[model samples]
Target: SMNPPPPETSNPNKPKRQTNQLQYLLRVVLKTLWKHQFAWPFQQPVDAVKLNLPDYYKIIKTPMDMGTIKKRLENNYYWNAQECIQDFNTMFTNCYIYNKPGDDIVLMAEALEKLFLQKINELPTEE
Candidate 1:
């Protein structure tokens, strides 16, 4: 029931085969990112109240995390690899904005971002 039916417009240009291939690669890269040690801080949504950061929501309009990204990937919410990668970038950028430049969390985000970029570069190019 979670999986929705395919779209009505099944044109040759919109090939399911290519879509599946990209999805598979995305999954692999996502898993690697999630398992990283630096991934701990970005695993879930930031708690503004608990952390006592009143301006968190105001400063970060579009908050993202690995858990949300994982759910989106499982539900096929992303149309392409870039969309998913953009979300990851958003997650890291959010950390950069909220934390100081040399903060531990910021350092972790930088490391994870580097690994993410390296992995994505290995993916086959899309048409």
Candidate 2:
């Protein structure tokens, strides 16, 4: 289910050299984020039942996590860096929506967001 149909183009044999390079860069950024100290909570999907937050699913319609983002990246779900960046934003936004301000998890999300922004900004601009 994760794999979607490839885009229809006349030359199927042609390689997407630029996209491949972009993917490689994105993978590097993702690895750095994974190594971040504040990445623990965002590493996997939230366990609503186990954590006793029964309303979590109801509140957050589009659940996002680093694991899911990694999978999507591997599956070529994102066509561009901006699409990938948006998922990271969604992950952090979900945390803000579900958790109270000034909470430790919120603080971690903020830190992670700052780091993500800084890392992505370091990437070379695409032509």
Candidate 3:
């Protein structure tokens, strides 16, 4: 049997986090992760969780029909992995470009890392 998709962790602060600036940066983060995982596709899901994804997982849904899955499989070379990476990529690209240099890198990263590690550690893991 195929591996079940990861349970979506709901983001409590979706409205604020879903702002265009944050989403665009997140796409940049996920895109970097996606390119890195090009060799071992199966580990990508686990990697996504580690990359502060739960915070914005529900900001939008990535619609994937069988045809979509087929195409993703044909391109990504994986059947089980979800398509959120590309979804975020195309989505952020189509939206209005947040060109202004919105600040906060080191501080934002430190805070998000602490929050994500705390949250992820609390999730029930497979034995």
Candidate 4:
């Protein structure tokens, strides 16, 4: 249910075009995916589904790059959508301890990925 925080008061210092909650939440979702469960690149064996979860969740929940990553998706004039997707894809393939995300984790990642792509798609097609 990708719930977003309340609409923040308009920031006069920050240009309206520079930030928005959708993008912010999208970053949060992506960062969260990376912080906790599956580090990416490491696909899990279906037979070992219940081996570990909390460890991954904790890691995925604490990413510090959301700010910079979100900006890349905004009108930073230097935003690179394809590069961003590629970066995420690369990360998605590398999991902690060479461990891939389990079924629930993969489902969650897919859900957030879908949302992130939707928000990015809502913008004018990048050049």
How do all models score by TM-score? Answer: 0.78, 0.78, 0.23, 0.34
Q: Rank the candidates by TM-score, best first.
A: 1, 2, 4, 3
Candidate 1 vs candidate 3, TM-score winner: 1
lDDT: worst 10-residue window of model 3 = 92-101
Q: Write the per-residue lDDT of candidate 3 for residues 1-127, one digit (tens) a residue.
A: 1233542333344322223323322334333333332212222332235544453334324322223322333343331212333443333332212212333433333343344344333433222
TM-score of structure candidate 3: 0.23
For model 4, residues 1-127, the per-residue Cα lDDT tens digits are: 1222322223445533333433443465445544544334222212122553434443443221233344444444222345445544443343322355666546555655665566555544323
Candidate 1 C-alpha lDDT tens digits along 1-127: 1222322222344423336535754567778888898888787777777777788887887888887777666656656777677888899999999889999989999999898888777776665
Error of 1 at 71 (Å): 0.3
For model 2, what is the error of residue 119's alpha carbon versus the real structure, in angstroms, after optimal superposition? 1.0
Superposition error at 17 for model 2 (Å): 9.1
What tens-digit string does per-residue lDDT give for candidate 2 at 5-89?
A: 3222224453333474356545666887888898888877887766778888878887788877776666666567776787888
Q: What ranges in model 3 sit over 4 Å off?
A: 1-5, 9-17, 37-39, 42-127
User: lDDT for every model?
Assistant: 0.73, 0.73, 0.32, 0.41
